[PDB]
Specification:
The complex is a heterodimer. By secondary structure, chain A is α+β, with helices and mostly antiparallel strands. Chain A folds into two domains: 143 residues, Substrate Binding Domain Of DNAk, Chain A, domain 1 (Sandwich); 157 residues, Aar2, C-terminal domain-like (Serine Threonine Protein Phosphatase 5, Tetratricopeptide repeat, Alpha Horseshoe), CATH 1.25.40.550. In chain A, 41% of the residues lie in helices and 17% in strands. Chain A contains twelve helices and ten strands. In chain A, helix 7 packs antiparallel against helix 8. The radius of gyration of chain A is 21 Å and the shape is elongated. By secondary structure, chain B is α/β, with parallel strands linked by helices. Chain B has two domains: 155 residues, 2-Layer Sandwich (Nucleotidyltransferase, domain 5); 74 residues, Acyl-CoA Binding Protein (Up-down Bundle). Chain B has six helices and eight strands. In chain B, the strands form two sheets. In chain B, strands 7-6-1-4-5-8 form a six-stranded mixed beta sheet, with helices on both faces. A two-stranded antiparallel sheet of chain B has the order 2-3. In chain B, helix 2 links the parallel strand 6 and strand 7. The relative contact order of chain B is 0.14. The chains are: A alpha+beta, B alpha/beta. At the A-B interface, helix 5 of A face helix 1 and helix 2 of B. Chain A: It is found in: Cytoplasm; Nucleus. Chain A: It comes from Saccharomyces cerevisiae (strain ATCC 204508 / S288c) (Baker's yeast). Chain A: Belongs to the AAR2 family.
């Protein structure tokens, strides 16, 4: 189990750790989160009590270093930092636990929720989407635009998701215009899977990282990317049997975890009615369709 | 963006553009079979591609053989249209390719866009206008060349005859569409009106009668009267 200590908490803030969150009061003696399951990626995120705008946070993996939070009063935010002195870090962690100033990552043992939302998410792939290679952890926030969005301004602070565009030369082979635009299997299986992602696990991981950025930061471009990756598959007549069964699980947990009140801005009506009822794959997402009908019948 | 009554005079500036109308590309007759089911029989059709500034019409004839062995023909027909319009553009000198293509039905946007990917700087636009180009097969000489075709074929016309020698393209297009509107709403009456007088003929190289300026005025007034009468009839107004 791992620990992320905080130096202090100088300002009132709601803290998230994966799908959990806690309110922390200004200068409350709060010094970090313990018991964080090793083995997965994690995200620790922030919403100031004063600015309900700009949710921001950090994706990280405890196997890649000792990470801690410290508020910066020049930049006005909780910053993730890495302690390179292992001994110094055990020393702080042990002292705070002894003083019991830390909340415990509150995992229910039956619950695979987080695993199921990050199964294919790798930290090495994250750090290519959020390029900032002097850091082992990755910063994301509400307002960061994607590379495709930048095309239709600052590249250091962009999300470099894989560009999908149904009306592009990439997606459409000359002479198979109608075929390739109605049946995207070529684009999914040769261009994207064999071409760019190399395997379905990397595809699935980006899909999953995109949803979680949409859900946790309300990142609009990340929601766009998520829905594009779903549509590409659902509009493909030929998809490995193993990918469809894994997608149905992937989406199930994503729909299951979403805040009910956010279903209006996080779920694109068109894409879901297409995938569930019109596409090639309309009969192949049996768990996803059942949970959508029972939780969000209005949207369909 | 969409073409509508507001940006209507853009059609007559010097930026090259084409209308595409696909309504007569896939044409069928419906009939009963011996067992008493219903079957369709396709007939030859056409793509109505038109430069409203100059009157040049590119009449691409769609031979029934194009459909042989295909499914979902009404959908196929939108993709064929896009394929043929693309081939036309590719066939034109650069300085002649259009800067815009206006589709008369929003279903053509996606197929043309896909087929026009090689021409990113040609803008594909829909329209809100209710243009009557589906009546183009009420123009005898056009219906004849489509119905007599024995293979795929492209045939060039000027749909304004020589009108532009005396009127602006604004006025030419308005006469064209008033004419086609009348043919659409009551074909028999419209045609009666154009051809009642045997002494006014159609030149071999023309589509319409060689009316004098004054006679065109009587004609246009008759077509208007026709259209309004048919409207009163349709709605009991």
């Amino acid at each position: 189990m791992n620990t992320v200590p905080f130096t202090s908490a100088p300002i009132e803030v709601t803290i998230g750790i994966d799908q959990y969150s806690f309110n922390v009061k200004e200068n409350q003696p709060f010094h970090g989160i313990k018991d964080i399951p090793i083995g997965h990626v994690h995200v620790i995120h922030f919403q100031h009590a004063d600015n309900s705008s700009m949710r921001y946070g950090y994706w990280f993996d405890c196997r890649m270093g000792n990470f801690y939070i410290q508020y910066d009063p020049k930049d006005g935010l909780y910053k993730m930092m890495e302690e390179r002195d292992g001994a110094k870090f055990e020393n702080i962690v042990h002292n705070f636990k002894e003083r019991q100033m830390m909340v415990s990552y509150p995992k229910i043992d039956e619950d695979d929720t987080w695993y199921n939302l990050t199964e294919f998410v790798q930290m090495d792939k994250i750090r290519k989407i959020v390029r900032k290679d002097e850091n082992q952890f990755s910063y994301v926030d509400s307002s960061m635009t994607t590379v495709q969005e930048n095309e239709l301004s600052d590249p250091a602070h962009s999300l470099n998701y894989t560009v999908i565009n149904f009306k592009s030369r990439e997606a459409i082979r000359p002479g198979h215009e109608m075929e390739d635009f109605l049946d995207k299997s070529y684009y999914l299986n040769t261009v994207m899977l064999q071409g760019i992602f190399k395997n379905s696990s990397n595809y699935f991981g980006e899909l999953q990282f995109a949803f979680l950025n949409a859900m946790f930061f309300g990142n609009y471009g990340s929601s766009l990317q998520w829905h594009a990756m779903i549509e590409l598959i659902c509009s493909s007549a030929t998809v490995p049997k193993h990918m469809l069964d894994k997608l149905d699980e992937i989406l199930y947990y994503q729909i299951k975890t979403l805040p009910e009140q956010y279903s209006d801005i996080l779920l694109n009506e068109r894409v879901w009615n297409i995938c569930l009822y019109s596409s090639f794959q309309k009969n192949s997402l049996h768990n996803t369709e059942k949970i959508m009908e029972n939780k969000y019948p209005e949207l369909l | 963006g969409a073409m509508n009554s507001s940006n209507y005079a853009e059609l007559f500036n010097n930026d090259i553009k084409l209308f595409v109308d696909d309504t007569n590309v896939y044409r069928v007759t419906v009939h009963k079979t011996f067992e008493g089911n219903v079957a369709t029989k396709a007939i030859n059709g056409c793509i109505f591609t038109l430069n409203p500034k100059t009157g040049h019409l590119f009449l691409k004839i769609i031979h029934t053989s194009v459909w042989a062995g295909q499914k979902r023909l009404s959908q196929l027909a939108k993709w064929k249209t896009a394929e043929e319009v693309s081939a036309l553009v590719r066939s034109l000198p650069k300085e002649e390719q259009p800067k815009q293509i206006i589709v008369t039905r929003k279903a053509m946007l996606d197929p043309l866009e896909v087929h026009m990917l090689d021409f990113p700087n040609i803008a594909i636009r829909p329209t809100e206008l209710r243009l009557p180009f589906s009546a183009a097969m009420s123009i005898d000489k056009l219906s004849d060349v489509v119905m007599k075709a024995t293979e795929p074929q492209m045939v060039l016309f000027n749909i304004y005859d020589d009108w532009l020698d005396r009127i602006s393209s604004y006025t030419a297009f308005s006469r064209l569409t008033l004419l086609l509107r009348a043919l659409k709403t009551n074909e028999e009456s419209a045609k009666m009106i154009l051809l009642s007088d045997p002494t006014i003929t159609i030149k071999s190289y023309h589509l319409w009668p060689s009316f004098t300026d004054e006679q065109w005025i009587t004609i246009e007034s008759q077509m208007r009267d026709l259209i309004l009468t048919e409207y009163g009839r349709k709605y009991n107004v």
